[PDB]
């Protein structure tokens, strides 16, 4: 044809954005990865989504797994392929070998198979084809050049037939050659690499479109997660800087704080509370989560440092009954150890729960605990993710950070998140006469005026009481002021 | 079946959590690793727990070790296989070669072996199968493709038989190919990798479930230990943030402290005492452990810096008789150099002893010492483990930390554990008039009010005496203050 | 000895034969092997590791021009 290469949607979450529309129609895409990367799942989801969203029949050619198994496995994702096979929308073509045995039936090899796939295609009026582990077929006794030819032959016949195909390959090195024979890379029109990178005893799955002959696509690796719903990719670099921005205000749950912020936090905003350990970030969170219930709004408190029970003990000791918020179905507590997941996973759990609960406010107690272990770059990516999501969803977010050093801290954040944020509330210890007092300061607020004082404050059962500034002192920011008389 | 694959529990501690229920029934799981990683043990434990806990017979196929040796080595874990063989619950089928000699044993091999296996399975009504090192079978003269097919044949036949199987393979590189031929990884539906990673001159064993076709499972490596009870895995990432939390108070063993903490520590709480060397962390510990005996409760003191003798000399000089606490069976001391093991080992020793003694209190004199060498992330993981265990077990835990720099310390912890902890007791030196005095502060307390004073304190034979704050000083925290007030008293 | 002209599988069989006969005889044996890399495969043919009951690795590590010998029971 005379125009811009057309793409078939995969409907696999996030993939069509990365690929700028989908898989190129009528050509085949190589998808390779090491064991357990999700090659097989990709290729099934491509067919399954075809059938269920466009009523495009599919043909799935298997060389190793058994059709019963392919079917059985899909149940993991709540997919009934046996039904689809019955309705004639899906056809799994068994090309695996005889557990029993013979060695002279496939002397007509590529040729013959190519006929059965063409027969199947015509028969079911197939639009999508997935060949699972072509690699395993020549893993009979071949050399690079022999593979290049067979692959080419196949790709080509399918091109003639007009089918959009997904071919699956295996690799042994996460960052080494693209597929086993260092030849499939160049014979396909498109290449997709699925990686399961190790790094620190944790595993991180990434998907990469290495090339799409004829169109554009997002470059590099994107994290993804295999869930009950199959492959889920987050193109964190595909999120646009187009979030809605209002002037409406909301309370912090602490009136005086509201005053200092020039009448409260903005609804559309990302508020950061930083401070040495024990300064009172968590008390603010409690208070901010409570204010959303007293106004009959839903709030989620994602906790990564305290148990659901402890959170309740400490909250109740500050007034506020978290128990009720729970029943009233106005407040939801989560709680998990940063270690019980990858940032990718965490991010999704968060999104996920936000979707099932549709909160108005959200508080993540200690981003600084989520940064444990992870790389700064991996972590920043996470923050932009959760931040950006809350921002485009009109949810007001309160995030917490504990600074590594009490008193004398020379930066707002050790991870340098402060720019990714709209409002920064800052808590610090101040040594006043052999005692450790606290001080709160609205460091910055983006669309408002806010107070510039570093007010001292106390914590009682009643909660946070913000008092006055240390007017008669110098170097209050050092943590060790110098009362000047 | 219209259901997603079901799993068989291995009962191997920690494994069913990592594998979300067990191994997939009717399929085979490839377990591979380098020499001495624990392959053979995993496979034996899988059959053993199969028989002892569900009365599911097992067939163990062996290609290299002798049935007598497999039975003999299992005695290391208190397992009498010879008995089970006897009662027809376990059947070791010997597939090893005879120390004499025959050629061309590749063909009939698989097939014969397969009905030998089928025969045995059918004969004993086996539900579980372990094939030990299939690897060694084609290690007769083969190339990758021949391996791939043979494997496939075998797995397949077993699938047909309906057996849940554990297959074992060797590797030569800790992070190299999954299994010798670079082919086994793909033929198997499930793959488990046992690693015995070096690093420093210590070895750390990890288990990873790489893939389970059909279901979910935890990802990554998990440290485990081989013990007299076999493989023991700690899914430190599977521990849930659901620990019970009470408002009950308990004493620190120092009244004045108790006041400062708004009436003593919380029963449910992790306490951290920090400060430069010689400030008295160990004194606080001793006192905290004694307090649990004087109340006839059990306490364990895991010490990593002092001998059991030294602890006793120093204790007695502070009053408190550790001798009695011992006899009375209320106090138990441990002691061990951080270097005499890996963090995984330590964590387990701690847990183990907490189970045999059921303490109400526990103190670890110096986390800081356990941090010697180990990486920060390995360490933090360790702390969350001991910390969380303590917490879900209602045991009050006091941990100690020596800061790397006396005076001027700008962070509570050098390893940044301060967020993992409920109450923080800080000890510091204060230079006052050419002399080194001490100060004690309750830096933070999660559920109470605590005192914000940086009180000076002395140490005598009576123990710790907490005096008053340094009100007329600026830069206390810095360790080197400055006195103030320029108006003594004059006329009108 | 097999450094005469052999491949991995031939070595595994021969070793196994020897070790086996020795165990029958009732002897407690120490068998020595060479390696070329201080941290690579355990022994030459990457096969002796699994054929023996116990494995001990002697290392002589370089690192900064000094040499440090270590013994490990693997
Ligand atoms: N419901 C589920 N929830 C979470 N993860 C799942 C679920 N089902 C399967 N998985 C995961 O997905 C993986 C499946 O990968 P898959 O079968 O797609 O093919 P593959 O890894 O590409 O290739 P191979 O045929 O070599 O195994 C499993 O290893 C497992 O980690
Ligand atoms: N009932 C109470 N009465 C007086 N002060 C309290 C009370 N509860 C807590 N506090 C004070 O508040 C502090 C608790 O801090 P909080 O739980 O708000 O979290 P944080 O400082 O933000 O974070 P983290 O606890 O992880 O360091 C304690 O140090 C203590 O001084
Ligand atoms: N009771 C025990 N306590 C602690 N460790 C033990 C005990 N018994 C055995 N071990 C350890 O476990 C190891 C046994 O490993 P195992 O026999 O399970 O198989 P392998 O290493 O997987 O394979 P192979 O030795 O056949 O190459 C020993 O090397 C030893 O380190
Ligand atoms: N009988 C005593 N009388 C007066 N002071 C004592 C007595 N015993 C110990 N001390 C003092 O207490 C200090 C001992 O410190 P302690 O045993 O409390 O542990 P630490 O400071 O926490 O840790 P570490 O000893 O490893 O540095 C000595 O430096 C000394 O000044
Ligand atoms: Mg907190
Ligand atoms: Mg000490």
UniProtKB/Swiss-Prot annotation, chain B:
<dbReference type="GO" id="GO:0003677">
    <property type="term" value="F:DNA binding"/>
</dbReference>
<feature type="binding site">
    <location>
        <position position="444"/>
    </location>
    <ligand>
        <name>ATP 2</name>
    </ligand>
</feature>
<dbReference type="InterPro" id="IPR047222">
    <property type="entry name" value="KaiC_C"/>
</dbReference>
<feature type="binding site">
    <location>
        <position position="37"/>
    </location>
    <ligand>
        <name>ATP 1</name>
    </ligand>
</feature>
<feature type="binding site">
    <location>
        <position position="446"/>
    </location>
    <ligand>
        <name>ATP 2</name>
    </ligand>
</feature>
<feature type="binding site">
    <location>
        <position position="212"/>
    </location>
    <ligand>
        <name>ATP 1</name>
    </ligand>
</feature>
<feature type="binding site">
    <location>
        <position position="36"/>
    </location>
    <ligand>
        <name>ATP 1</name>
    </ligand>
</feature>
<feature type="binding site">
    <location>
        <position position="227"/>
    </location>
    <ligand>
        <name>ATP 1</name>
    </ligand>
</feature>
<feature type="region of interest" description="Linker">
    <location>
        <begin position="235"/>
        <end position="247"/>
    </location>
</feature>
<dbReference type="InterPro" id="IPR047221">
    <property type="entry name" value="KaiC_N"/>
</dbReference>
<feature type="active site" description="Proton acceptor in CII (KaiC 2)">
    <location>
        <position position="305"/>
    </location>
</feature>
<feature type="binding site">
    <location>
        <position position="215"/>
    </location>
    <ligand>
        <name>ATP 1</name>
    </ligand>
</feature>
<feature type="domain" description="KaiC 2">
    <location>
        <begin position="248"/>
        <end position="492"/>
    </location>
</feature>
<keyword id="KW-0378">Hydrolase</keyword>
<feature type="binding site">
    <location>
        <position position="211"/>
    </location>
    <ligand>
        <name>ATP 1</name>
    </ligand>
</feature>
<comment type="subunit">
    <text>Homohexamer resembling 2 stacked donuts with a central pore nearly blocked on one side; hexamerization is dependent on ATP-binding. Binds 12 ATP; 6 between each subunit in both layers. KaiB only binds to phospho-Ser-431 KaiC (not doubly phosphorylated KaiC). Complex formation between KaiB and KaiC is regulated by the phosphorylation state of KaiC and by an ATP hydrolysis-driven conformation change in the CI ring of KaiC; complex formation is slow. Slow complex formation is crucial for the timing of the circadian period.</text>
</comment>
<feature type="binding site">
    <location>
        <position position="283"/>
    </location>
    <ligand>
        <name>ATP 2</name>
    </ligand>
</feature>
<feature type="binding site">
    <location>
        <position position="279"/>
    </location>
    <ligand>
        <name>ATP 2</name>
    </ligand>
</feature>
<keyword id="KW-0418">Kinase</keyword>
<comment type="function">
    <text>The level of KaiC phosphorylation and KaiC ATPase activity represent the key features of the biochemical oscillator. KaiA homodimer binding to the KaiC CII domain stimulates KaiC's ATPase activity and forms KaiA(2-4):KaiC(6) complexes, which stimulate KaiC autophosphorylation first on Thr-419 then Ser-418. Phospho-Ser-431-KaiC accumulation triggers binding of KaiB to CI to form the KaiB(6):KaiC(6) complex, leading to changes in the output regulators CikA and SasA.</text>
</comment>
<dbReference type="GO" id="GO:0070297">
    <property type="term" value="P:regulation of phosphorelay signal transduction system"/>
</dbReference>
<keyword id="KW-0460">Magnesium</keyword>
Curated annotation (Swiss-Prot), chain C:
<protein>
    <recommendedName>
        <fullName>Circadian clock oscillator protein KaiC</fullName>
    </recommendedName>
</protein>
<comment type="similarity">
    <text>Belongs to the KaiC family.</text>
</comment>
<comment type="function">
    <text>The level of KaiC phosphorylation and KaiC ATPase activity represent the key features of the biochemical oscillator. Phospho-Ser-431-KaiC accumulation triggers binding of KaiB to CI to form the KaiB(6):KaiC(6) complex, leading to changes in the output regulators CikA and SasA.</text>
</comment>
<comment type="function">
    <text>The KaiABC oscillator complex constitutes the main circadian regulator in cyanobacteria. Complex composition changes during the circadian cycle to control KaiC phosphorylation; KaiA stimulates KaiC autophosphorylation, while KaiB sequesters KaiA, leading to KaiC autodephosphorylation. The Kai complex controls chromosome condensation, leading to a transcription accessible chromosome during the first half of the circadian cycle and a compact, less transcription-accessible chromosome during the latter half. Clock output pathways impact the RpaA transcriptional regulator.</text>
</comment>
<comment type="subunit">
    <text>Homohexamer resembling 2 stacked donuts with a central pore nearly blocked on one side; hexamerization is dependent on ATP-binding. Binds 12 ATP; 6 between each subunit in both layers. KaiB only binds to phospho-Ser-431 KaiC (not doubly phosphorylated KaiC). Complex formation between KaiB and KaiC is regulated by the phosphorylation state of KaiC and by an ATP hydrolysis-driven conformation change in the CI ring of KaiC; complex formation is slow. Slow complex formation is crucial for the timing of the circadian period.</text>
</comment>
